[PDB]
Amino acid sequence: MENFQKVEKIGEGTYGVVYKARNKLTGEVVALKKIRVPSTAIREISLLKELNHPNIVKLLDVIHTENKLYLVFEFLHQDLKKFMDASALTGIPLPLIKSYLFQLLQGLAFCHSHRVLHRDLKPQNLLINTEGAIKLADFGLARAFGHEVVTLWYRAPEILLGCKYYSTAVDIWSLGCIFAEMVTRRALFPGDSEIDQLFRIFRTLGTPDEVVWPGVTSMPDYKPSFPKWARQDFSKVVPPLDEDGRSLLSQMLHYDPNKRISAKAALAHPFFQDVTKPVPHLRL
Ligand SMILES: COc1ccc2sc3c(c2c1)NC[C@@H](CN)NC3=O
Numbered sequence: 001m002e003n004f005q006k007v008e009k010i011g012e013g014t015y016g017v018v019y020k021a022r023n024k025l026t027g028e029v030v031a032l033k034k035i036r037v038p039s040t041a042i043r044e045i046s047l048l049k050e051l052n053h054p055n056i057v058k059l060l061d062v063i064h065t066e067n068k069l070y071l072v073f074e075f076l077h078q079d080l081k082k083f084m085d086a087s088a089l090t091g092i093p094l095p096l097i098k099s100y101l102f103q104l105l106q107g108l109a110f111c112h113s114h115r116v117l118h119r120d121l122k123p124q125n126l127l128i129n130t131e132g133a134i135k136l137a138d139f140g141l142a143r144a145f146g147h148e149v150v151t152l153w154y155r156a157p158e159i160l161l162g163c164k165y166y167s168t169a170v171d172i173w174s175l176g177c178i179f180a181e182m183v184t185r186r187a188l189f190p191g192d193s194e195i196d197q198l199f200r201i202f203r204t205l206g207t208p209d210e211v212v213w214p215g216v217t218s219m220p221d222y223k224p225s226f227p228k229w230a231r232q233d234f235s236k237v238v239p240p241l242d243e244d245g246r247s248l249l250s251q252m253l254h255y256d257p258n259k260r261i262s263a264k265a266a267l268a269h270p271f272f273q274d275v276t277k278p279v280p281h282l283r284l
Pocket residue numbers: 010011012013014018031033057073074075076077124125127137138
């Protein structure tokens with residue numbers, strides 16, 4: 001830690017505080033996350049250091065000293081949340097939306113192929129650079145460790161319904177929600193409690209039943225007393241988006257996690273037929 005000089009606080013992660021810092025040896029500028037240690041943690045983390053991909057924020061180093069764990073990450077200058085807030089008036093152009101969606105699907109396909117799930121995808125966890133890249137951040141830290149409130153907006157329905165042994169499908173759901181948000185400039189399911197989140201999902205996609213999601217009625221927190229809402233049109237949900245886009249989104253938002261499209265399959269979707277890599281307008 002003496003080898004690092006803090007520059008500024010750039011966030012309060014879920015696990016601790018995050019600083020922009022400079023490495024006194026390498027001269028490197030990095031994102032330092034101070035985690036306030038179980039052996040089980042150390043080893044799962046050391047596994048993440050090897051999960052290297054262009055669309056995954058690189059874990060540079062893991063420093064364990066004095067009952068503190070420090071995670072040293074690659075630094076990027078902006079997150080999708082800020083970029084979305086900044087692009088609110090005209091919206092992110094569709095080609096850049098497609099590019100970002102495509103890259104994140106690549107990152108997920110990679111993680112998922114190695115049986116690693118993100119668990120907590122959200123705009124604040126997706127970092128961008130001037131080159132038009134977008135990267136998954138805080139990847140794998142959820143399985144590692146377990147005042148600000150945790151956002152539920154991107155949580156898959158199987159997690160909300162109490163499934164303990166959920167799959168890579170949860171990340172696809174979250175990315176579907178982010179996709180919709182880029183397109184419409186409004187969060188898709190902005191719930192403020194677990195039941196509000198679930199009921200917001202139900203009101204748009206219809207209350208799930210055994211027809212569309214076999215086994216749903218036996219989930220830990222399923223209640224027969226859930227109100228029954230009918231499903232709405234995707235044409236109403238993400239209007240501007242073309243049919244290829246709406247088709248892909250619908251498959252990312254399937255209720256049944258086993259019907260939900262995989263990241264690999266999604267990369268082959270016709271939506272990506274004309275994908276390109278534009279450069280964003282970023283003010284840093
Ligand atoms: C700036 O480049 C980075 C790189 C890695 C990481 S990790 C992390 C970051 C962050 C930012 N930002 C604060 C929040 C976002 N969820 N929590 C975190 O743990």
